[PDB]
Design a protein around this nucleic acid. Structure first.
Ligand SMILES: [Mg+2]
Ligand SMILES: [Mg+2]
Ligand SMILES: [Mg+2]
Ligand SMILES: [Mg+2]
Ligand SMILES: [Mg+2]
Ligand SMILES: [Mg+2]
Ligand SMILES: [Mg+2]
Ligand SMILES: [Mg+2]
Ligand SMILES: [Mg+2]
Ligand SMILES: [Mg+2]
Ligand SMILES: [Mg+2]
Ligand SMILES: [Mg+2]
Ligand SMILES: [Mg+2]
Ligand SMILES: [Mg+2]
Ligand SMILES: [Mg+2]
Ligand SMILES: [Mg+2]
Ligand SMILES: [Mg+2]
Ligand SMILES: [Mg+2]
Ligand SMILES: [Mg+2]
Ligand SMILES: [Mg+2]
Ligand SMILES: [Mg+2]
Ligand SMILES: [Mg+2]
Ligand SMILES: [Mg+2]
Ligand SMILES: [Mg+2]
Ligand SMILES: [Mg+2]
Ligand SMILES: [Mg+2]
Ligand SMILES: [Mg+2]
Ligand SMILES: [Mg+2]
Ligand SMILES: [Mg+2]
Ligand SMILES: [Mg+2]
Ligand SMILES: [Mg+2]
Ligand SMILES: [Mg+2]
Ligand SMILES: [Mg+2]
Ligand SMILES: [Mg+2]
Ligand SMILES: [Mg+2]
Ligand SMILES: [Mg+2]
Ligand SMILES: [Mg+2]
Ligand SMILES: [Mg+2]
Ligand SMILES: [Mg+2]
Ligand SMILES: [Mg+2]
Ligand SMILES: [Mg+2]
Ligand SMILES: [Mg+2]
Ligand SMILES: [Mg+2]
Ligand SMILES: [Mg+2]
Ligand SMILES: [Mg+2]
Ligand SMILES: [Mg+2]
Ligand SMILES: [Mg+2]
Ligand SMILES: [Mg+2]
Ligand SMILES: [Mg+2]
Ligand SMILES: [Mg+2]
Ligand SMILES: [Mg+2]
Ligand SMILES: [Mg+2]
Ligand SMILES: [Mg+2]
Ligand SMILES: [Mg+2]
Ligand SMILES: [Mg+2]
Ligand SMILES: [Mg+2]
Ligand SMILES: [Mg+2]
Ligand SMILES: [Mg+2]
Ligand SMILES: [Mg+2]
Ligand SMILES: [Mg+2]
Ligand SMILES: [Mg+2]
Ligand SMILES: [Mg+2]
Ligand SMILES: [Mg+2]
Ligand SMILES: [Mg+2]
Ligand SMILES: [Mg+2]
Ligand SMILES: [Mg+2]
Ligand SMILES: [Mg+2]
Ligand SMILES: [Mg+2]
Ligand SMILES: [Mg+2]
Ligand SMILES: [Mg+2]
Ligand SMILES: [Mg+2]
Ligand SMILES: [Mg+2]
Ligand SMILES: [Mg+2]
Ligand SMILES: [Mg+2]
Ligand SMILES: [Mg+2]
Ligand SMILES: [Mg+2]
Ligand SMILES: [Mg+2]
Ligand SMILES: [Mg+2]
Ligand SMILES: [Mg+2]
Ligand SMILES: [Mg+2]
Ligand SMILES: [Mg+2]
Ligand SMILES: [Mg+2]
Ligand SMILES: [Mg+2]
Ligand SMILES: [Mg+2]
Ligand SMILES: [Mg+2]
Ligand SMILES: [Mg+2]
Ligand SMILES: [Mg+2]
Ligand SMILES: [Mg+2]
Ligand SMILES: [Mg+2]
Ligand SMILES: [Mg+2]
Lengths: 88, 82
RNA sequence: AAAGAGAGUUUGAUCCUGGCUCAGGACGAACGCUGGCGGCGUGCCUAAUACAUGCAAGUCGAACGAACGGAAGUUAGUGGCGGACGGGUGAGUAACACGUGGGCAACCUGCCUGUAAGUUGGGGAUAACUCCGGGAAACCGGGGCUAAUACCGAAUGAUAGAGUGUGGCGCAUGCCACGCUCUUGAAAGAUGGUUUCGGCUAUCGCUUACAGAUGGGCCCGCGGUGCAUUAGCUAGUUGGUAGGGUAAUGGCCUACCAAGGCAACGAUGCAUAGCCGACCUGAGAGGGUGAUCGGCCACACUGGGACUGAGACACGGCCCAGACUCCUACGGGAGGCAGCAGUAGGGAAUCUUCCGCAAUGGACGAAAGUCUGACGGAGCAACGCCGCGUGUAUGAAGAAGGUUUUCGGAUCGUAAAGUACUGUUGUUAGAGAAGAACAAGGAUAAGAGUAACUGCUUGUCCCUUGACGGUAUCUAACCAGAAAGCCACGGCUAACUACGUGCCAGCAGCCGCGGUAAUACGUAGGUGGCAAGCGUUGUCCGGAUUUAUUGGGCGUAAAGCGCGCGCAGGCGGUCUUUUAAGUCUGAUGUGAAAGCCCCCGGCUUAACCGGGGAGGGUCAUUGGAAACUG
């Protein structure tokens, strides 16, 4: 089951996450299908950059955001679009 | 075994082995008594194709044979019917 | 744009050829002397040797029969999913294993997403439990009782099979769409709202079918190693006919038939080796390597086999055989650190039997939640890279004391000592981060679906969680106080004087120094290179144009076969027309991420870490040009 999740990279006690699409089976920092965006939690206003087009393409093919990703996509505001394109 | 979840697997697989071997050899007997009937051109050759067909695709629903395997064998037996 | 340093050594002296040696850079390094700190990384290269002791794979009572509780509320076994992922190693392997590019009209795919049909009716058991029996123990038999989403029939339902009709087609085998006849193939309930109880209904499920996504299977072109003092190799081998088997084509297997197939464009054999992105060096072309990080492969004490499953011939699963260790009441039993730590051994050589699921990602669950030596952190080691501390300023023709002196002086030396100043570091005491998003739970609002709810999807508020760790980081004060070594000084190569020894002790990369005035041995004074280091050894590239495509040669220095006839191969006079294999050029797809390079930004700077880009192919499809080779 392919799902979108964070990927930890950076230095010791300085994490930086890169939103990727990959299977659950593959390692956390291993194979991935493609990359969507990044996520910096250290910045006090957390800044995130997303494709907003590859995500919606993937979520109509059987992709599920994880716990932290869903908060990111909701705050950015594309799960509304996933709502509207589903029923419309 | 020495992981508690592994002791169950070794003994629950034997129960599946027992049930599978029993009805897998039931399938082969129906085929065994068809091709010999086809050679003799008896009247039983026609209706021995039906339960052999019934045995083959019942095994698919039971899940111990692939649907391509069942579909293939039925076609090849039908040729021998003459 | 980029763009290349030489020196010593054959001779009485010279010019060439030619080897040897040196100056540079890099290690997963080791050893010797020395040793303050912080940040980021790295750490069994040998025995794929043998392994004490702990922990690394479980979960679900919202699928089915118990103990605390006056019968409210929480905890074994059957059953489902997961154990095929995550983690380790480099033995084997010279081949579709890998890299790159294609084909599958010759294939499969649990969980995930969408859509369409339904989820109707029965039956027989068996664990657990309860007795009996056997054995030291592992554990094995017999009798009786019970349930399920466990198991097995039944009704209905195939684009599954057979026989056809039509069309539209393609690459030969063949494909796509629709229609007709006949035969087979399915299922499960659980938790709630409503009504009434009939019944309906929400959520999670269950069966069949088709799509998408994901992960795999098979085939093919090209590419990357030594030996010819290794010339033949092969017999299911090569092709065909019929059948078997597989998810799928195929000698994959079998019977028959024929005798073929490969090789000097290097078969076969021996030796060595996981492959790549990449790393080191180099002006470049190349040469050497494949540790850490990422992708693929093979292996799991040594051989062989299969079961269960969507997926295995399965690291912490099973069966047999072998070697080894252990327990036996002698009948028999139990094991596998190339998982995280750790032990012995080998070695010149490599770390803790630590803390947490707080963050990320996994398995189960409807959810809290449980599991996670993955992963986050901490510990040891100057192993490497980066940063800066061992005090600053002024101060004598010049303190004492070393060391030398043709004895007047010179040098250590503005360095002492003195005065003035600072606290990076230190010691003490006070303040104290980010990493946290959550999930769940509570109110709402809007939607699809409803006879109506419950419930589902999205939005906003309330509440909640830190191993690191009182860590990083500030400000308050006192102290120049606790913090400098290593190698060389004849030339190459920056830096010279005394004393001791007397071909002895000794030095050495090369030339070569030492035989009672040694800038070369040993010690001092002084100096020169670096600095928390500095030297030596081992390995690789460079210099080496010393295998010369870029970039050498064969009269006398090494080097023209004693000469001819000639198969294969290499090369080929002049012009015209055509073709488009070589050649040049445009578009599309791809050459992952990380790394080198370019442009910006964050850590007080750097190392380091982010964002974007570039480069990288004798690559595939397709369109052009016609001078040159064909
Ligand atoms: Mg924050
Ligand atoms: Mg039936
Ligand atoms: Mg001479
Ligand atoms: Mg020379
Ligand atoms: Mg150089
Ligand atoms: Mg050097
Ligand atoms: Mg020390
Ligand atoms: Mg020491
Ligand atoms: Mg090893
Ligand atoms: Mg072995
Ligand atoms: Mg043990
Ligand atoms: Mg634990
Ligand atoms: Mg219950
Ligand atoms: Mg459930
Ligand atoms: Mg239980
Ligand atoms: Mg693995
Ligand atoms: Mg190997
Ligand atoms: Mg390796
Ligand atoms: Mg490929
Ligand atoms: Mg019964
Ligand atoms: Mg019994
Ligand atoms: Mg019984
Ligand atoms: Mg039917
Ligand atoms: Mg039926
Ligand atoms: Mg299903
Ligand atoms: Mg794989
Ligand atoms: Mg094949
Ligand atoms: Mg090849
Ligand atoms: Mg055939
Ligand atoms: Mg063969
Ligand atoms: Mg060979
Ligand atoms: Mg060069
Ligand atoms: Mg190169
Ligand atoms: Mg290793
Ligand atoms: Mg071993
Ligand atoms: Mg199976
Ligand atoms: Mg095995
Ligand atoms: Mg296993
Ligand atoms: Mg394997
Ligand atoms: Mg494994
Ligand atoms: Mg083990
Ligand atoms: Mg044994
Ligand atoms: Mg270990
Ligand atoms: Mg040892
Ligand atoms: Mg030793
Ligand atoms: Mg966790
Ligand atoms: Mg989690
Ligand atoms: Mg779930
Ligand atoms: Mg455990
Ligand atoms: Mg732990
Ligand atoms: Mg770790
Ligand atoms: Mg250090
Ligand atoms: Mg040392
Ligand atoms: Mg004096
Ligand atoms: Mg004096
Ligand atoms: Mg301070
Ligand atoms: Mg304090
Ligand atoms: Mg304090
Ligand atoms: Mg969370
Ligand atoms: Mg919530
Ligand atoms: Mg509401
Ligand atoms: Mg509402
Ligand atoms: Mg909501
Ligand atoms: Mg404090
Ligand atoms: Mg301050
Ligand atoms: Mg002071
Ligand atoms: Mg000099
Ligand atoms: Mg002397
Ligand atoms: Mg010397
Ligand atoms: Mg000397
Ligand atoms: Mg000295
Ligand atoms: Mg000095
Ligand atoms: Mg330094
Ligand atoms: Mg060194
Ligand atoms: Mg050396
Ligand atoms: Mg060269
Ligand atoms: Mg020459
Ligand atoms: Mg010549
Ligand atoms: Mg001569
Ligand atoms: Mg000669
Ligand atoms: Mg001649
Ligand atoms: Mg010729
Ligand atoms: Mg010509
Ligand atoms: Mg020619
Ligand atoms: Mg790349
Ligand atoms: Mg900056
Ligand atoms: Mg970087
Ligand atoms: Mg980049
Ligand atoms: Mg022409
Ligand atoms: Mg033309």
């Amino acid at each position: 089951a392919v799902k979108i999740r964070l990927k930890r990279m950076g230095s010791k006690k300085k994490p930086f996450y890169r939103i990727v699409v990959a299977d659950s089976r593959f390692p956390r920092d291993g194979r991935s299908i493609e990359t969507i965006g990044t996520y910096n939690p250290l910045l006090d206003p957390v800044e995130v950059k997303i494709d907003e087009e590859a995500t919606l393409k993937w979520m109509h093919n059987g992709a599920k955001p994880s716990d932290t990703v869903r908060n990111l996509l909701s705050r950015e505001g594309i799960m509304e679009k996933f709502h509207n394109q589903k029923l419309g | 075994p020495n992981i508690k979840s592994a002791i169950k697997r070794v003994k629950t697989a034997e129960t599946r082995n027992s049930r599978n071997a029993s009805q897998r050899s039931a399938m082969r007997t129906a085929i065994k008594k068809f091709d010999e009937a086809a050679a003799n051109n008896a009247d039983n050759a026609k209706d021995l194709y039906v339960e052999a067909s019934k045995k083959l695709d019942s095994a698919v629903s039971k899940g111990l044979i692939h649907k391509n395997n069942a579909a293939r064998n039925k076609s090849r037996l039908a040729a021998k019917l003459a």
